[PDB]
Amino acid sequence: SDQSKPDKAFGEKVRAYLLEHPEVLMEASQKLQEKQAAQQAVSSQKAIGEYRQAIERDPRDIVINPAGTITVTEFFDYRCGYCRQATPAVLELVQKNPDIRLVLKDFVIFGNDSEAAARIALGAKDQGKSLELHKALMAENALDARGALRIAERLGIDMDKAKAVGESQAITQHLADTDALARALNLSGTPAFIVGDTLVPGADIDALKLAIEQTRAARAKA
Amino acid sequence: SDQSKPDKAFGEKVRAYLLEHPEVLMEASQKLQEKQAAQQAVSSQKAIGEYRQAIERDPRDIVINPAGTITVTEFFDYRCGYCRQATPAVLELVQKNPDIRLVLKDFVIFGNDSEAAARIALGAKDQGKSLELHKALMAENALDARGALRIAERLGIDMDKAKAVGESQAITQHLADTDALARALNLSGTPAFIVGDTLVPGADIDALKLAIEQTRAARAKA
Amino acid sequence: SDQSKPDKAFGEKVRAYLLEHPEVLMEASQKLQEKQAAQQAVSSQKAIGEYRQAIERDPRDIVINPAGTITVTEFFDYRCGYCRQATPAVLELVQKNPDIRLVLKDFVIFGNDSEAAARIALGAKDQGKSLELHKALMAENALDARGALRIAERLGIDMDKAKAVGESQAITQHLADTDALARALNLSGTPAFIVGDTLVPGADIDALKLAIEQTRAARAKA
């Protein structure tokens, strides 16, 4: 060709169709949304793999069943209702599958009370009562800072030493770095589970069970 | 046919038109919005008909001119400015058209003050001073709970008995069930008028007048 | 023609293309956004020209280097961080280009503290210390009403007379009319610069420098 040649009749027919069947635009918008979601999924799993050393293998982290082969990281806040309602199931899942390694990240999204519960937990970490304290703190309906201390006291934790480690600048740096890790993983809130490349946003227990099964099978393929 | 045959030239012409006349997408989006609005209108009128027994014929409700053939239900809050500015016109409309039956639903959307005005009105319901108390409460600019009591006192209402009925668990259940009815009718706020199948959202006096005329004519067709 | 003749095959091909290349809709949406932005730009510059007498030539306004040919109007709030960070550069720009006439509009968007700083500045206007007071008020990190008075006192301003003029009903009308002018210019916040027909929304120093150059060149074309 050597000439741009307009075709008004073709355009009129295009407009007529679109106006008479505008649902085509909804369908195309849905295609684009599925495209955008797949892009986000790829970015999330690439980030999970980039920071896996920090997500799954941080010495400062509280780890339930450190023998586990499959590492499930949980970002949580001790006063988030979704975290509290998912906690019993998470602990039952570690209870029934010993090959699970549960990394507990303290992702404080609320105020001083939640920060206080996290610091107590991290201070008592090395006294070997993390499973019980985690379950008990999550069990209190309206967990205060005073309540958190009373719960940790009622479990025989060395309170003087747990409080000393909790407020230390090391625990402060630990929590700050965890907040940074959540930001790098583009997390939106709590709970947020990370198993394999998968990210489970929220208290979606069934999805987390499925992801653990997938990772067990995939890692078993060797 | 036996073969899917691509046509890149047709698609290029489609893209060219859309990019050169993207207003077609606005026009199609407008068509879809009109479709969605008509769907919502149908759902609203079907719901109004489903719960008509509760909307128009609840013995606990305050009813102005119970003789009326045409039932106009109003969901209102005594401290909503739109309700207060529409009230004089609503009462003039019942004043000039005796065949109107005005059901007064107390749809408390604000705090304790509004709840207090509603309870006083429902407590004094059976003392035969509802029109006057409704108009006077709506007339006070900054209606407090103290103010509402002073208004009801200045109208000769038996205050000891009106206060006794107001706080009763019956009035509490009445208000709770009304809040539920508004939720089932997908109401967004106050005022909200319901005449025939029509729902008038807000202080749209002209639309309400028109809807009463339509229902009078339709019910007169027998 | 004498007949509307449907063409289902043409419409199916349109739908197929759109679903297989829905990015065409994003591209068309971008075209429409560029169209809407150009419309807004035209409306803004037409409004700037309509109210130029008020923007650039209001006797009550504080004006730095009133000799300047090029009038740059700034809407600002003494406690807006963007205004405080842009202020040093604005003053350096007047410092290096004498032909600039800087009109200072007090666009109070915050509470009493900002209103107090503006009233002090407008009260001291006629004592010939506006450049210094403007720079000093903008220099205080957490400017209070008490702080603003201490800054104006530390600059030798006649405090009794500056305070008398500040609270006067004239200064109140001045600020109210400025708030009205910003509303007529559809301003969204502070800072907001106006030079020639151009409106620079925010602390976009480079754009403001460019706009001053353009206006200098255009007005020099005679």
Author numbering:
A (entry chain A), B (entry chain A), C (entry chain A): 2 to 223
What text appears in the publication on this structure?
Curiously, the suppressor of copper sensitivity C proteins (ScsCs), which are part of the bacterial copper-resistance response, share structural and functional similarities with DSB oxidase and isomerase proteins, including the presence of a catalytic thioredoxin domain. Here, the structure and function of Caulobacter crescentus ScsC (CcScsC) have been characterized. It is shown that CcScsC binds copper in the copper(I) form with subpicomolar affinity and that its isomerase activity is comparable to that of Escherichia coli DsbC, the prototypical dimeric bacterial isomerase. Using mass photometry and small-angle X-ray scattering (SAXS) the protein is demonstrated to be trimeric in solution, like PmScsC, and not dimeric like EcDsbC.
For our structural studies, we used a variant of CcScsC in which the second residue Cys2 is mutated to Ser (CcScsC C2S). One possible explanation for this is that CcScsC wt may form a disulfide bond between the N-terminal cysteines at the high concentration required for crystallization (above 100 mg ml−1, well above physiological levels) and this may interfere with the crystallization process. Replacing Cys2 with Ser in the C2S variant does not affect the disulfide isomerase activity or trimerization of the protein. The crystal structure of CcScsC, solved to a resolution of 2.63 Å, confirms that the protein is trimeric and that the trimer is formed through the interaction of the N-terminal regions of three protomers. The α-helix joins the globular domain of the protein at Tyr52. The globular domain of the CcScsC C2S protomer is a typical thioredoxin fold with two catalytic cysteines (positions 81 and 84; pink sticks in Fig. 6) in close proximity to a cis-Pro motif (Thr191–cis-Pro192). In the unit cell, six protomers are organized by crystallographic symmetry into two trimers. Each trimer is formed from the interaction of the N-terminal α-helical regions of three protomers. While we captured a single conformation of CcScsC C2S in the crystal structure, the comparison between the scattering profiles predicted from the crystal structure and the experimental SAXS data provides strong evidence that the protein trimer can sample multiple conformational states in solution.
